[PDB]
């Protein structure tokens, strides 16, 4: 349906929020987390409605599983502010599990809780959340140290085998998010990466992302300022 749809650009603010939430659940299933998180967050501010009250719990519940997959691990504070902490509460445990990066904790917690999760629309995603936990463990092992033995890592994350650690590490490098080398024969992971953001072409990229979020904010502030006066101008005042 979505491929055939066209949303008007002159639709009102409630209409946009409802549309965006609903679209957000759909792209998240496809493997597009990046646009899915942004659409869900913006809907809540866009329209504070009395309709909106029924929606909010779902939006946050779905949103958190959706973030973990993108590759951000959300902080504690976010749970605290909307005072809906309790609704968020079973989710909060899944979060503490990713920051530690240990596999074993994730599977148990997610299962008992899983029954509740089915409701939001999370079930399809739920399986994939397994892989994020380890991905966070791999990033910490490579980044922190140079060489630590493969056996030390196997125990820490609670993988099934020392062998299992090799295969997972080997895949992660190809994706290129880790930026390390695993030496299979030598019995260790070597850190090829070094922590930097001024070295390569990259300080420019660092500026690029910072500037990029801004271009949208600027366009909105300026247009919005003009907007009550546009109606006064039409009402015939100079």
């Amino acid at each position: 349906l979505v491929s055939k749809s066209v949303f008007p650009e002159q639709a009102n603010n409630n209409e946009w929020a409802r549309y965006l939430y609903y679209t957000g659940r759909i792209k998240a299933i496809q493997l597009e987390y990046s646009e899915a998180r942004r659409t869900m967050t913006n809907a809540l501010r866009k329209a504070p409605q009395h309709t909106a009250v029924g929606f909010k719990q779902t939006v946050h519940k779905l949103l958190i599983v959706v973030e973990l997959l993108l590759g951000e691990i959300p902080d504690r504070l976010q749970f605290r502010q909307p005072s809906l902490k309790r609704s968020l509460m079973p989710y909060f445990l899944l979060t503490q599990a990713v920051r530690t990066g240990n596999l074993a904790k994730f599977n148990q917690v997610l299962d008992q809780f899983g029954e509740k999760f089915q409701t939001d629309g999370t079930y399809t995603l739920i399986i994939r959340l397994r892989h994020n936990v380890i991905k966070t463990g791999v990033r910490m092992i490579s980044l922190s140290y140079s060489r630590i033995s493969l056996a030390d890592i196997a125990q820490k994350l609670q993988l099934d085998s020392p062998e299992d650690a090799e295969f997972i590490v080997a895949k992660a490098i190809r994706d290129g998010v880790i930026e390390a080398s695993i030496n299979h024969e030598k019995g260790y992971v070597q850190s090829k990466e070094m922590i930097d953001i001024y070295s390569t072409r990259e300080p420019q990229l660092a500026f690029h992302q910072r500037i990029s979020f801004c271009l949208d904010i600027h366009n909105m502030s300026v247009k919005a300022m003009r907007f009550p006066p546009k109606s006064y101008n039409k009402d015939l005042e100079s």
Binding site: D75, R76, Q96, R99, T100
Partner: peptide
């Protein structure tokens, strides 16, 4: 993040005493 404070106070005092004996 995670709550490092509860765990560190108990671990730091106890572990350190065994470590004294184990290593320099």
């Amino acid at each position: 993040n995670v709550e490092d404070d509860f765990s560190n106070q108990l671990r730091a005092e106890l572990e350190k005493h065994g470590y004294k004996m184990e290593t320099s």
